[PDB]
Design a protein around this motif. Structure first.
Motif, PDB file in Angstrom:
ATOM      1  N   UNK A 159      33.563 -37.141  14.458  1.00  0.00           N
ATOM      2  CA  UNK A 159      32.747 -36.949  15.644  1.00  0.00           C
ATOM      3  C   UNK A 159      32.912 -35.555  16.224  1.00  0.00           C
ATOM      4  N   UNK A 160      34.139 -35.075  16.324  1.00  0.00           N
ATOM      5  CA  UNK A 160      34.401 -33.749  16.860  1.00  0.00           C
ATOM      6  C   UNK A 160      34.061 -32.688  15.821  1.00  0.00           C
ATOM      7  N   UNK A 161      33.280 -31.677  16.173  1.00  0.00           N
ATOM      8  CA  UNK A 161      32.952 -30.626  15.208  1.00  0.00           C
ATOM      9  C   UNK A 161      34.013 -29.543  15.169  1.00  0.00           C
ATOM     10  N   UNK A 162      34.076 -28.840  14.045  1.00  0.00           N
ATOM     11  CA  UNK A 162      35.076 -27.800  13.855  1.00  0.00           C
ATOM     12  C   UNK A 162      34.439 -26.639  13.119  1.00  0.00           C
ATOM     13  N   UNK A 206      32.730 -17.244  11.356  1.00  0.00           N
ATOM     14  CA  UNK A 206      32.736 -18.704  11.398  1.00  0.00           C
ATOM     15  C   UNK A 206      31.683 -19.264  12.341  1.00  0.00           C
ATOM     16  N   UNK A 207      31.130 -20.402  11.948  1.00  0.00           N
ATOM     17  CA  UNK A 207      30.084 -21.096  12.684  1.00  0.00           C
ATOM     18  C   UNK A 207      30.567 -22.511  12.977  1.00  0.00           C
ATOM     19  N   UNK A 208      30.377 -22.965  14.213  1.00  0.00           N
ATOM     20  CA  UNK A 208      30.804 -24.308  14.582  1.00  0.00           C
ATOM     21  C   UNK A 208      29.900 -25.317  13.900  1.00  0.00           C
ATOM     22  N   UNK A 209      30.455 -26.090  12.982  1.00  0.00           N
ATOM     23  CA  UNK A 209      29.663 -27.053  12.246  1.00  0.00           C
ATOM     24  C   UNK A 209      30.231 -28.446  12.432  1.00  0.00           C
ATOM     25  N   UNK A 210      29.406 -29.426  12.085  1.00  0.00           N
ATOM     26  CA  UNK A 210      29.496 -30.717  12.745  1.00  0.00           C
ATOM     27  C   UNK A 210      30.511 -31.634  12.085  1.00  0.00           C
ATOM     28  N   UNK A 211      30.344 -31.913  10.797  1.00  0.00           N
ATOM     29  CA  UNK A 211      31.012 -33.059  10.191  1.00  0.00           C
ATOM     30  C   UNK A 211      31.747 -32.667   8.918  1.00  0.00           C
ATOM     31  N   UNK A 212      33.026 -33.017   8.866  1.00  0.00           N
ATOM     32  CA  UNK A 212      33.884 -32.989   7.702  1.00  0.00           C
ATOM     33  C   UNK A 212      34.737 -34.247   7.737  1.00  0.00           C
ATOM     34  N   UNK A 213      34.978 -34.887   6.600  1.00  0.00           N
ATOM     35  CA  UNK A 213      35.671 -36.176   6.614  1.00  0.00           C
ATOM     36  C   UNK A 213      37.128 -36.069   7.034  1.00  0.00           C
ATOM     37  N   UNK A 214      37.684 -37.210   7.436  1.00  0.00           N
ATOM     38  CA  UNK A 214      39.058 -37.303   7.901  1.00  0.00           C
ATOM     39  C   UNK A 214      39.781 -38.434   7.198  1.00  0.00           C
ATOM     40  N   UNK A 215      41.086 -38.255   6.999  1.00  0.00           N
ATOM     41  CA  UNK A 215      41.861 -39.331   6.411  1.00  0.00           C
ATOM     42  C   UNK A 215      42.079 -40.428   7.442  1.00  0.00           C
ATOM     43  N   UNK A 216      42.497 -41.581   6.961  1.00  0.00           N
ATOM     44  CA  UNK A 216      42.451 -42.760   7.795  1.00  0.00           C
ATOM     45  C   UNK A 216      43.755 -43.062   8.511  1.00  0.00           C
ATOM     46  N   UNK A 217      44.821 -42.295   8.251  1.00  0.00           N
ATOM     47  CA  UNK A 217      46.137 -42.472   8.875  1.00  0.00           C
ATOM     48  C   UNK A 217      46.681 -43.876   8.596  1.00  0.00           C
ATOM     49  N   UNK A 218      47.014 -44.056   7.312  1.00  0.00           N
ATOM     50  CA  UNK A 218      46.973 -45.343   6.615  1.00  0.00           C
ATOM     51  C   UNK A 218      47.800 -46.435   7.291  1.00  0.00           C
ATOM     52  N   UNK A 219      48.962 -46.099   7.826  1.00  0.00           N
ATOM     53  CA  UNK A 219      49.736 -47.039   8.624  1.00  0.00           C
ATOM     54  C   UNK A 219      49.827 -46.460  10.020  1.00  0.00           C
TER      55      UNK A 219
END
Lengths: 412, 107, 201, 513
Positions: free
Chosen positions: D48-51, D226-239
């Motif tokens: 959700x947060x862009x980077x 650099x350009x502020x862009x929207x979506x890159x995937x994230x790991x799920x923080x498994x435990x």
């Protein structure tokens, strides 16, 4: 063309030379892996023979002179025929990498001119050839490791800050500090002295605790006021100190992801979050702590009551511990969306909300949060908007969001 | 002469005398917040003797004002730290050091 | 099976199973027994020996000179020269000096080897065998160990041959400007007399 | 997923919860994701947060140009010219200035790195002074993104503090408040017409990199746009956590600690968890090669560089990096080799020098060998060398300190590796396609390597070697199906076992003789 203006000299072949470099590259080509071991030795022996016969007539120097000549401009001459000058030059250094690759006898004769190569290392237009040539020199002769001094290593270091992340620089430096078998311990102190302590060229690493925060489902966009009671502390159950932060946060912005976004997660870390509470309770806002004080300098200990305050129709947030004023200074921030309590923790910490079933509070100012839950809602607690939910089979996934005592009347 | 921030209160009254070995758990970081040393990392409480000139001066001075139970955020000025030379490898030249020390036991 | 380190490490391990007595052969001329009252010092020998050996692969020389100083002054270095003949520590220092000779390292090196010959007879015989290379390194000492290898024993005085001596008088012919003749001849006096009577041949 | 939808996936290992896998599936020639996996497969949701991000050729038309004052041109003549937030790569912390030249409304400023508010407007720290008596209440802070408005030569002069110019005319809003913050040079914009930006008293870039006379400014390839862009995937923080709650007084409670393993990039300041290097290749390969250099520098016994790196890699990190069964293939072997080359490869070579010398005292316990009880060796009174370890603290008695090695506790590790070996062989024996490093080389090779180097170093005594031989003998890791560079390690595992009997037998002969 090194004169003032020749401008008519026809004795300048380009397509006959730029062709010939690829023929020499292909002539000095190393044999592959996918080959039988009775002919791989033959091709290897023939390659070494070709390298030595090119060594003895000094063709290394004959290409070193063209490297001396061509490193004048940066884009030259009649600038249409000499359009390929970069693609010649990058193909030139490549030839230099092929003549020295096998023969240690070649590498010994290329001892003296390394200083000029690292002088040209700051040209930064054909540095890929220079780094390859130097790396293909340093592994092949131990004698060529004795020339190279501190002024060269610092230039190799400075290339790594000028040029980002180039792993071939570390493939050089991994071979600069260990030869064939031996360990050149004047270079190992030097590398440890320069590249290490800046923490700037390299990816520094650490381990932090998992942060998590909790919301009691209440939404608020007069003087709102809620309490806590901390009953178990654990100042150290890690090889590090734990955190426990209380405060408020807004809803329009900053999905609260654990650790992977901003520094370390938690609370008080974004601009939309306003938090407070520590051993020596000084606050947090925008993940930079300022140093507010109190006349005990205490912990969020096992025997304390925190008084948070937030003002309706006033941009003022000030806190209190055991009733004592701590000079809370959160003033004049944005009013967009709502506010809700968030209190964060990462330890073996158990804490008590005081909302009802209050335990000790003055109300001071005017609002308790037992009256913001007036119309239909109940006091249930969640995990700050919950992109997870820890379970066995399936943490059920979600869609984002769909988004008060002042409505409007309808006019006619 | 060194910045002593009390974090947790100890007892206040019993500050250690010279000639006693002091047990301390200490976690030190730089000015930037980058953690360069710990004592919790190896599960070993540090030990040192006052005045025998083994530890850096700001550490001994800030430990001399402390007490039993008392933990402190010692902020050492780089002239009392490793100084203009720094340390070869772990400390850059001329930087302030920020320790979270916590004294445990005495002699 | 590719990766031919695997094949070699397989077959060495295979052959050691079917030749156990050969393995016990190639381990018995290294063992040694010592009395209990000399346990505590030989560890301080052994721990000061490895600092030599670990310094084999590198101003880097001040460690070696102190190490050889701690070895030479040791209690058990006179007492059992079969040990120091069997640990290879004549060849260790020889290899260090050979690594140097591609200044004050060679001088405090060869004094240890000249100390090494004069403690036993068989030890001197063991030191003898590098003489053919060892003569080619006249610096100005590296020639003294060529001398004290043949200083006393008549069997070793008889054993060496004429090409070993021919390059010495070749070096003497090189002294046709001198000063280096006062040492070279100081070698050859040990080559022809060696007890009190001149060896005919 | 959509707006208010709840999804529920199941990646195998739920055959009881596999409802319709019987009637379609099994006999129809299919398989779930349960056929091998003993982990949980990680999930990669979109953020959700862009980077902000580098600029590839993945636009209809966006083109920054490194030119040589020393500017950076543009172009955006396309179908969608809505919002293009721009910033430079590296920031400045706490004298020089910075140019822009716009043809056509369009902003400039300074972004502090905590900024992910993609908004088509002007909006957003503001804390007052506290002197313990109230009584001041003025200010400590302003900043959070700065706003300004042929050739518009707006220039952001900084330090010190923050000012502005506008073609010679300094405007208002001098935000003179930043204690020691980091300041990205940055531009918020829409683009109407193409060729919209150009970038750059002394001059600028000297105040940025490490060489700091540097009065002629000079671009480097490390500078980006650099350009502020929207979506890159994230790991799920498994435990995640095992938090628990209550209702009468609301005891919210947690007691089981979990720790990260993060790394923060210093020049594009942000902290990434180390697992998300699994798909990001360049930030994987460069950290792997750095882990090689941390070993190659501290090689063959530099007992002061080891004391330097023990403050830098910091041992309870390594005990995580051994244990975590999710770390990538290269980065597992990197941390195992770093552990060996910091703490264990100093003494191990000092024992493989003295493996063929065999001397032994002749006192009474040496005679006491039974010689043959009618590898897990009983008495073994030989004269092997001596290990000393030093504590890597930071005091000024370091000249006596930096002489042996750093120390980290062997008693924990030598149970950790036996636990890891049993968990290794008994799980991976049934041919999962999982195993930890992706392929079974990174599963076994830097586990048996540590096991070998711990075996040599004089620990794993009788009580544990009896436990150890069960993993190989039973009379099994020696009997399984293995690739080439793991059985290469097992040959050197077997050779020391065969070589232990020779050390036994020589002491046997002396005890007889």
């Amino acid at each position: 063309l090194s004169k003032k203006a020749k401008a008519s000299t026809v004795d300048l072949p380009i397509e006959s030379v730029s062709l010939s470099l690829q023929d020499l590259i292909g002539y000095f080509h190393p044999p592959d892996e996918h080959l039988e071991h009775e002919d791989k030795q033959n091709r290897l022996r023939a390659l070494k023979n070709r390298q030595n016969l090119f060594q003895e007539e000094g063709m290394i120097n004959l290409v070193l002179e063209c490297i001396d000549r061509l490193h004048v401009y940066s884009s030259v001459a009649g600038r249409e025929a000499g359009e390929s000058w970069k693609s010649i030059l990058n193909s030139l250094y490549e030839l230099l990498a092929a003549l020295i690759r096998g023969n240690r006898k070649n590498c010994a004769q290329f001892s003296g001119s390394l200083d000029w190569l690292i002088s040209r290392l700051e040209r930064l237009e054909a540095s890929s050839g220079i780094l390859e040539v130097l790396h293909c020199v340093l592994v092949e002769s131990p004698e060529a490791l004795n020339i190279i001094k501190e002024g060269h290593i610092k230039s190799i270091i400075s290339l790594l800050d000028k040029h980002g992340r180039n792993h071939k620089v570390l493939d050089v430096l991994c071979s600069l500090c260990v030869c064939h078998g031996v360990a050149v311990r004047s270079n190992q102190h030097l590398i440890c002295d320069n590249l290490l302590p800046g923490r700037d060229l390299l990816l520094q690493t650490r381990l932090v605790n998992h942060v998590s925060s909790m919301r009691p489902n209440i939404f608020l966009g007069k003087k709102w006021y809620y309490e806590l009671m901390v009953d178990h502390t654990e100042p150290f159950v890690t090889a590090e100190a734990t955190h426990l932060r209380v405060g408020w946060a807004s809803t329009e912005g900053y999905s609260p992801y654990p650790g992977g976004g901003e520094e370390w997660g938690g609370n008080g870390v974004g601009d939309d979050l306003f938090s407070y509470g520590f051993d020596g309770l000084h606050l947090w806002s925008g993940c930079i702590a300022r140093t507010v004080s109190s006349p005990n300098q205490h912990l969020l200990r096992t025997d304390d009551v925190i008084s948070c305050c937030l003002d309706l129709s006033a941009p003022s947030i000030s806190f209190r511990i055991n009733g004592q004023p701590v000079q809370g200074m959160f003033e004049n921030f944005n009013i967009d969306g709502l506010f809700f309590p968030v209190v964060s923790f990462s330890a073996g910490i158990k804490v008590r909300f005081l909302l009802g079933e209050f335990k000790f509070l003055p109300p001071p100012g005017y609002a308790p949060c037992y009256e913001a839950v007036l119309p239909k809602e109940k006091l249930k607690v969640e995990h700050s908007r919950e992109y997870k939910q820890e379970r066995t089979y399936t943490r059920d996934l979600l869609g984002p969001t769909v988004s008060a005592f002042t409505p409007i009347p309808v006019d006619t | 002469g060194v910045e002593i921030e009390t974090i947790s209160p100890g007892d206040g009254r019993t500050f250690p005398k010279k000639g006693q070995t002091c047990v301390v758990h200490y976690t030190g970081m730089l000015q930037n917040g980058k953690k360069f040393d710990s004592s919790r990392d190896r599960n070993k409480p540090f030990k040192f003797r006052i005045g025998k000139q083994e530890v850096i001066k700001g550490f001994e001075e800030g430990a001399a004002q402390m007490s039993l139970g008392q933990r402190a955020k010692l902020t050492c000025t780089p002239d009392v730290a490793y100084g203009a030379t720094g340390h070869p490898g772990v400390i850059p030249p001329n930087a302030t050091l920020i320790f979270d020390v916590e004294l445990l036991n005495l002699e | 099976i590719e990766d031919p380190e695997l094949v070699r490490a397989m077959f060495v391990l295979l052959h050691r199973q079917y030749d156990g007595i050969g393995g016990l052969v190639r381990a018995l001329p290294k063992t040694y027994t010592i009395n209990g009252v000399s346990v505590e010092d030989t560890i301080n020998l052994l721990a000061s020996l490895g600092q030599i050996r670990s310094l084999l692969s590198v101003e880097e020389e001040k460690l070696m000179i102190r190490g050889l100083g701690d070895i030479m002054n040791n209690k058990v270095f006179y007492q059992h020269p079969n040990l120091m003949r069997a640990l290879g520590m004549h060849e260790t220092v020889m290899e260090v000096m050979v690594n140097v000779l591609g200044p004050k390292m060679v001088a405090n090196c060869c004094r240890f080897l000249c100390y090494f010959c004069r403690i036993s007879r068989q030890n001197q015989k063991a030191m003898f065998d590098h003489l053919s290379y060892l003569l080619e390194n006249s610096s100005v000492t590296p020639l003294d160990v060529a001398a004290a290898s043949v200083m006393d024993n008549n069997e070793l005085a008889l054993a060496l041959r004429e090409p070993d001596l021919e390059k010495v008088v070749r070096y003497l012919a090189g002294c046709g400007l001198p000063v280096e003749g006062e040492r070279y001849l100081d070698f050859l006096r040990f080559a022809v007399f060696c007890n009190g009577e001149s060896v005919e041949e | 997923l959509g707006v208010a939808q709840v999804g529920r996936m199941n990646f195998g290992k739920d055959v009881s919860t596999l409802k319709y896998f019987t009637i379609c599936g099994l006999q129809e020639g299919y398989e779930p994701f349960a056929v091998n996996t003993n982990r949980d497969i990680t999930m990669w949701l979109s953020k959700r947060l862009p980077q902000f991000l580098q600029v590839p050729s993945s636009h209809e038309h966006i083109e920054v140009t490194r030119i040589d004052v020393t500017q950076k041109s543009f172009g955006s003549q396309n179908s969608s010219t809505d919002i293009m937030f721009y910033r430079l790569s590296m920031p400045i912390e706490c004298t020089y200035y910075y140019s822009v030249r716009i043809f056509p409304n369009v902003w400039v400023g300074w972004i502090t790195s905590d900024f992910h508010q993609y908004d088509t407007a002007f909006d957003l720290v503001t804390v007052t002074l506290g002197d313990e008596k109230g009584k001041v209440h003025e200010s400590i802070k302003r900043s959070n993104y700065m706003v300004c408005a042929n050739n518009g030569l707006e220039i952001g002069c900084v330090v010190g503090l923050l000012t502005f110019t506008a073609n010679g005319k300094d405007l208002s809003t001098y935000y003179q408040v930043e204690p020691s913050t980091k300041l990205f040079p940055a531009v918020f914009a829409q683009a109407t017409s193409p060729n919209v930006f150009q970038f750059e008293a002394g001059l600028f870039k000297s105040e940025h990199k490490n060489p700091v006379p540097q009065c002629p400014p000079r671009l480097h390839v490390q500078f980006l746009s650099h350009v502020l862009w929207s979506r890159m995937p994230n790991q799920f923080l498994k435990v995640d956590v095992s938090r628990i709650s209550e209702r009468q007084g609301w005891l919210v409670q947690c007691l089981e600690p979990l720790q990260f393993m993060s790394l923060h990039i210093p020049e594009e300041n942000r902290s990434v968890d180390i697992l998300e290097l699994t798909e990001q290749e360049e930030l994987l390969k460069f950290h792997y090669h750095t882990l090689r250099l941390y070993s190659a520098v501290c090689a063959l016994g530099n007992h002061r560089v080891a004391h330097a790196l023990c403050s830098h890699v910091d041992e309870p990190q390594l005990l995580y990096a051994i244990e975590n069964k999710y770390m990538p293939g290269l980065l597992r072997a990197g941390y195992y080799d770093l552990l060996i080359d910091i703490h264990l490869s100093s003494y191990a070579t000092a024992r493989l020098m003295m493996n063929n010398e065999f001397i032994v005292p002749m006192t009474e316990e040496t005679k006491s060998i039974t010689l043959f009880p009618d590898p897990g060796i009983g008495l073994s009174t030989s004269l092997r060398p001596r290990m000393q370890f030093s504590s890597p603290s930071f005091v000024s008695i370091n000249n006596e300190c930096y002489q042996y090695s750093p120390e980290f506790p062997l008693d924990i590790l030598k149970a950790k590796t036996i636990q890891m070996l049993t968990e290794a062989v008994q799980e991976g024996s049934l041919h999962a396609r999982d195993p930890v490093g992706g392929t079974t080389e990174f599963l076994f090779v830097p586990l048996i390597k540590l096991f070998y180097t711990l075996l040599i170093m004089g620990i794993f005594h009788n009580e544990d070697l009896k436990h150890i031989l069960q993993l190989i003998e039973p009379s099994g890791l020696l009997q399984m199906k293995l690739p080439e560079p793991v059985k290469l390690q097992m040959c050197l595992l077997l050779q020391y076992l065969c070589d232990c009997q020779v050390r036994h037998r020589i002491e046997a002969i002396v005890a007889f003789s």
